[PDB]
Ligand binder design. Sequence first.
Ligand SMILES: *[C@@H]1O[C@H](CO)[C@@H](O[C@@H]2O[C@H](CO)[C@@H](O[C@@H]3O[C@H](CO[C@H]4O[C@H](CO)[C@@H](O[C@H]5O[C@H](CO)[C@@H](O)[C@H](O)[C@@H]5O)[C@H](O)[C@@H]4O)[C@@H](O)[C@H](O[C@H]4O[C@H](CO)[C@@H](O)[C@H](O)[C@@H]4O)[C@@H]3O)[C@H](O)[C@H]2NC(C)=O)[C@H](O)[C@H]1NC(C)=O
Ligand SMILES: C[C@H](C/C=C/C=C/CC/C=C/C=C\CCC(C)(C)C)[C@@H](O)[C@H](O)[C@H](O)[C@@H](O)[C@@H](O)[C@@H]1OC(=O)[C@H](O)[C@H]1O
Ligand SMILES: *[C@@H]1O[C@H](CO)[C@@H](O[C@@H]2O[C@H](CO)[C@@H](O)[C@H](O)[C@H]2NC(C)=O)[C@H](O)[C@H]1NC(C)=O
Ligand SMILES: *[C@@H]1O[C@H](CO)[C@@H](O[C@@H]2O[C@H](CO)[C@@H](O)[C@H](O)[C@H]2NC(C)=O)[C@H](O)[C@H]1NC(C)=O
Ligand SMILES: *[C@@H]1O[C@H](CO)[C@@H](O)[C@H](O)[C@H]1NC(C)=O
Ligand code: BEF
Ligand SMILES: [Mg+2]
Lengths: 1088, 349
Amino acid sequence: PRSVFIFATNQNVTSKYTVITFIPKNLFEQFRRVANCFFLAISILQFFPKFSTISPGLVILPLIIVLAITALKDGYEDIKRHQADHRTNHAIVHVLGLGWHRTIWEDVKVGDFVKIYENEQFPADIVICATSEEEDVAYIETKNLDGETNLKSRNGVPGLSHLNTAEACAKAHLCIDLDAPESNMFRLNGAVINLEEYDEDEQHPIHPITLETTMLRGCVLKNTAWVIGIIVYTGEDTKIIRNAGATPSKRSKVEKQMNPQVIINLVILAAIAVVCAIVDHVNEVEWDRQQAYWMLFADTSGDNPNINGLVTFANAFITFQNIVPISLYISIEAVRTIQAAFIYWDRDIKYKKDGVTTRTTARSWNLSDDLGQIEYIFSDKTGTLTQNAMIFRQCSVGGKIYTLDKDLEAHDSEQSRILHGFFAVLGLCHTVLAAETEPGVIEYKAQSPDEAALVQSAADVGFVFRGRDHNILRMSTPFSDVSDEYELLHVLEFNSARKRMSVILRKLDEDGRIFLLCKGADNVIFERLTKDSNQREMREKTDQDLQYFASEGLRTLCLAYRILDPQVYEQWAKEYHNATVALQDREERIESVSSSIERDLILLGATAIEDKLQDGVPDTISDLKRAGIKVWVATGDKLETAVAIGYTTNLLTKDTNLIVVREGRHSIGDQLREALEEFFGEDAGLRTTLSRDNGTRPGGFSLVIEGHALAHCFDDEETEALLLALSTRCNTVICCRVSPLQKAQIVHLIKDNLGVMCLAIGDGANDVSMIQAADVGVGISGEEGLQAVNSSDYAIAQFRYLKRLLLVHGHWSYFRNSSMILNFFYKNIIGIGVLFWFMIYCGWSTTYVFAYVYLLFWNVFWTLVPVIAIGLFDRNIDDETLMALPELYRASREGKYFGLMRFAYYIFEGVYQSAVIYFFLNYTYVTTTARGDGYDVYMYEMSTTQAIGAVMVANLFSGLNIDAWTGWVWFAIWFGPFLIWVFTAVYSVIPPSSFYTGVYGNDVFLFRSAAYWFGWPFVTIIALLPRYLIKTFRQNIFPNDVDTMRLVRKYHPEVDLYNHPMLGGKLAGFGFTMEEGGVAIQRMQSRL
Amino acid sequence: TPKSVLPTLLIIGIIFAPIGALIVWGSGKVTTITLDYTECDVDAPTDGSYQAMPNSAYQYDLATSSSVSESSIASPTWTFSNDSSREVGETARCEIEFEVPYDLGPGLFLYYKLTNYYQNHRRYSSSFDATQLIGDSRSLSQINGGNCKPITSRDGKPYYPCGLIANSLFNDTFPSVVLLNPTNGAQNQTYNFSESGIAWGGIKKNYASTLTYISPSDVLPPPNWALKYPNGYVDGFPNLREDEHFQVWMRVAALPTFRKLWARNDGEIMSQGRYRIVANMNYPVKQFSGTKSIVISTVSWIGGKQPFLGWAYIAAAILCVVLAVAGLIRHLVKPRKLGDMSLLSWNQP
Ligand SMILES: *[C@@H]1O[C@H](CO)[C@@H](O[C@@H]2O[C@H](CO)[C@@H](O[C@@H]3O[C@H](CO[C@H]4O[C@H](CO)[C@@H](O[C@H]5O[C@H](CO)[C@@H](O)[C@H](O)[C@@H]5O)[C@H](O)[C@@H]4O)[C@@H](O)[C@H](O[C@H]4O[C@H](CO)[C@@H](O)[C@H](O)[C@@H]4O)[C@@H]3O)[C@H](O)[C@H]2NC(C)=O)[C@H](O)[C@H]1NC(C)=O
Ligand SMILES: C[C@H](C/C=C/C=C/CC/C=C/C=C\CCC(C)(C)C)[C@@H](O)[C@H](O)[C@H](O)[C@@H](O)[C@@H](O)[C@@H]1OC(=O)[C@H](O)[C@H]1O
Ligand SMILES: *[C@@H]1O[C@H](CO)[C@@H](O[C@@H]2O[C@H](CO)[C@@H](O)[C@H](O)[C@H]2NC(C)=O)[C@H](O)[C@H]1NC(C)=O
Ligand SMILES: *[C@@H]1O[C@H](CO)[C@@H](O[C@@H]2O[C@H](CO)[C@@H](O)[C@H](O)[C@H]2NC(C)=O)[C@H](O)[C@H]1NC(C)=O
Ligand SMILES: *[C@@H]1O[C@H](CO)[C@@H](O)[C@H](O)[C@H]1NC(C)=O
Ligand code: BEF
Ligand SMILES: [Mg+2]
């Protein structure tokens, strides 16, 4: 509790790091990579004088560079996060200071007084105090589930008495009884009490505070006049922030798979070190017993054996440190950053509407390769699959469809009379207020998008609604300015299973005819008619028309009519007045009254409203399902809207059977078990998981489950397992009326029980939690507070942008990263293997065969550009084919590019090639002179020949491992060896006076030797022949879809991907929204 | 794709075969004589007579054009003489008489081969101070903390040259190779091996003729040079630049079995006959199961006698031809259409 008098600070604080504590947490998250720990251990070991090779500073420099680069990356990411958060915590909110002064959303503690005006968000949770319309009622918007404008009534007694600022200052009505901050968005409690208020017992009255009085943070977009309130539950105790979560530190699956590979390499290095230490110790003991010339003076505390065995162990760990290179992670980070830049610079995922351009921004500069392994997509409905725009499309008037009305209206045809009645019902049976701010416009402020669209369409195509300036309604038919009396409202509010809404009215003319105008669903209205024969024919025609409306996909309301005689009108008015005050079972009494008045109706027609989806959503979902990605919908909206959207988005095809699970009657677990038994019983694998209505046509199953059923599933484990089995065995799952935590729970359920990669896309706080709970989170920018955008890893503006993003960028990034990592491991294994194969012949003393310059620059100069080119520019297949054929996504989705088998293949290829290099060149140089000058063969001649051969082999292997080819590939592949050749040519002429250089004269001993010129090419050819043959035979015998399509595109460009018999030709209702009580109930009291 | 792979294999084979044949031919144009005199201390007669060397102590590697056989050449004979009245470095002499079956053309080189001698060991390979060798100013602390361990200094006097490589200098000499049956008259003819030029001319610059910062009396000779410099550097510093045996030895060998050049001749022909070579046995190698040999070899365009690369090329060519034939047979048996669409995942039952 709080008990504030007139707590949690402020600010969203979405920043991962802080200025005070950035280095420690960044260093920890960097040292979660194991390889960093190994590098630190090696550097600390080399700090000692015995193991120093160059200098402590230059040894520590690579690790410092890696740490600094990763820290700068994370710092830039968190600075972007800070900017995004500051765009939120520096808005304008008017807070009392005897005037309302501007604030910055931060100097707002619990208490205060905030005036929020119209069409702007809330700083925190407030308690309604006054509003400018009537009864201090206000209105809210979406971004907190649902898709309609809600209502907040009043604070009760504290309502009014605070119209101006002076009353707020002079009154100290506080000591609220606010309960504990909870994540649930349906419970708040309190009591204003007030400092100066006394009842008949001289006690301060208690004024309850409920959800109908409070209004939460980050979701108002108020659609009424100014509102004043008291800030409560401010800061991190708000509903929205509490339903959100802390920003995670996500890592790609490729890194998590790289960790075991690094561990395997470290184990191999440890085994090499152990063997070297044992053999060197035995050899040194033997060579010290019999005094060899290389073991003289081995009696000191640091040069004797045993200690020399330990020193050999350490020197083995130092010599073969490239088996886990440090340049690998720098290159990976740079490549991933440039891939994020490519995502940003793509013009096909750039949105430009109304003069503002929204590029696709990668919030997380890693996770690019994660986009290529998506198996499940969890999508919000409102704002993600929908544009939040209701447009009237078609209207049926009795028998005739429309998509002419002026020509039809002959004022004599019965169809014209029915049209008049239909439009009158459409324009009068509505709880919509009309504003006369601008003549002719007649602004319509409706509480539901459906009502607003219907009234606007009625005004545009005839009968215009004037307004409710008094208790008598007015209408504007295109003949004159008519008006009719307004009788008592009879709104059912789409509540208590009353899928209807009726308005009793009266005519101001001398006729004085009492007519009831009713609208509602199809079944209720149709069963609620007086059908003798003619109404039966009209009903069957309208049923056919409504089936046509639902076939195309539309939301339909059936209008009705009735003429009330004055006697029955008065009798039912008396009955309604009596049932108004009934105490017990008041809802039952009003339901009986509604049934009594609704005894017979004459049909007028039906409507058809379209909930406009974002452009390309059905095509995008079709392409995603072709790619093998299972798309789910997790929305806070009601079941009917969700299932209708699923039908319209091709998520739920016409050949699917719906399993609707909701709380009621039978238990949720029993419902899931019965569904499994009755729909998937003929499954062999179902019995493994068994160890503990409604549909269209057979051919597939889809699951629709509500929030309460999900809660009951997640409470226990058996029901959770049943839910997992049913959801995995179904095509798509639609989750309706789910809290943010329930979205996170669904994502975690899939990601933990199945272990598959997951993607979450949405545009709200619920989507914020769902995004943080997933492997890749995508936010949609829709001017909705940008919270999902701020908490996401990628920010798109359209769903089709997600389609392209995945299909091309994720596949390419996964391919490039896998190939780059494998090639890095391969080249480092080549170098280490040549060293090791020499260590066979040296007595296992851990001595560098190469001159140290050739091993020092192995990754800096000799082999860097082929790996960078593979990681940045390599393309397995062109983007047109990937967009045209989503089925090519299988290889990336099934993880066939990165794994332990490919890693082992590359490691063993490197081992074999290094063996070929070293052994062939060694047995070549086992001779007397190797030239005609007679000079002896010393170690560095053979070493330099082997080093040049190894560089050539590694670069040409990387070149063979590139599917695409251009001039730049040749540039890199021959820029490595060009560097090593020029370095050997120049470094071997540096005079000893200038620099010792160790290898003086190799330009004479190598470039004039037949051994060099016939050994490096032979070594290259023999090392690369198995790879060439394997690649050719794999592409020509066991070909993938990508390889086959690359061949088809290269040799048959005329083939049309979209429409080809084997490539493209094979391709391989009712809805209404209402506030459900509240102001409509308060409308009854006002009009009573 | 195999249409661009089989011709590649054929071209690789057709290019590799001539190169391998040429390398084999060049290696076979070389003659090598090896004489293992390690066991001359105990297995050779000491009375002045000559006894035939064991069959495992010599190895003739004749040219391909030779008309004689390996077994046809008479076995070399050796004698031993250990007299203490001769000067230091020549007390123990092993005289080996060997026959050269055919005239060996100009370009005859004399090597010594050391087996089981690990110059590539980590302690030995880096046990030298280049800065001191080049003549720069090195202090006692710097040489003590340098790579010259464990032979750095004693009693405040640094070792010059320091390190294990310099300490283990091969002090076995082969002063004379003399023909015993010269055809051009005279009782004998001396084959003029020259010890100059046995190292490349740039190896000199790594070493200094003299040191200008420490007096010779303040430098200790290496511990194993005591028998050569008994009282120390009393006649000035050793001229490490003007002697080429030291420069040849300092170059670390790749393998334990290695050959280092010792004297050469470039303008004379070793005529057919019997030659007597004297070796001054001063470098013991028997302690660590090592052997020291004498290698006399000519040179071709590839250097010494090693046909390994040529045979590797020939084997690679044969393998490539076999693979190309097999691939051609397979392609003719079942030719497959490139860029088909019936083997895609969706276009299959
Ligand atoms: C051609 O070259 C070869 C080798 O290149 C020469 O042969 C070498 O000649 C050296 C000089 O005569 C010999 O060194 C001497 O050895 C004697 C005795 O040897 C033993 O001495 C110790 C036991 O009593 C002990 O010495 C150390 O040996 C190792 C390092 O040498 C250490 O690891 C070990 O722990 C010992 O501490 C060994 O057991 C030896 O086996 C020594 O007494 C001599 O010491 C004297 O000189 C040194 C010089 O620096 C001085 O400090 C001492 O205080 C003392 O005055 C000296 O070390 C060497 O053994 C020998 N090697 C072989 C394989 O024969 C050959 O002479 C040369 N010939 C020509 C003509 O040039
Ligand atoms: C300056 C260079 C490295 C530069 C780092 C700075 C990078 C800026 C951005 C990162 C670039 C690297 C690759 C990407 C290329 C693009 C940016 C994608 C075009 C060297 O200074 C670097 O330090 C060397 O790579 C070696 O020093 C080191 O990596 C060596 O590797 C080893 O195996 C050794 O253990 C270690 O000594
Ligand atoms: C030549 O003879 C001398 C002495 O006659 C040998 O030197 C001796 O070698 C033995 C080896 O058992 C040592 O114990 C002695 O200390 C050495 N010196 C003396 C004065 O006896 C020398 O080794 C012989 N050369 C050989 C065998 O090649
Ligand atoms: C090695 O050099 C010596 C001396 O220059 C050569 O000996 C001479 O040989 C010629 C040829 O018969 C004689 O006329 C001289 O009288 C010799 N001089 C001496 C001092 O003996 C010897 O021939 C050279 N060896 C070779 C193989 O050319
Ligand atoms: C060569 O002959 C000369 C004179 O006949 C003789 O003094 C010398 O000892 C001989 N050299 C040998 C036999 O090695
Ligand atoms: F449309 Be979602 F439920 F925010
Ligand atoms: Mg949304």
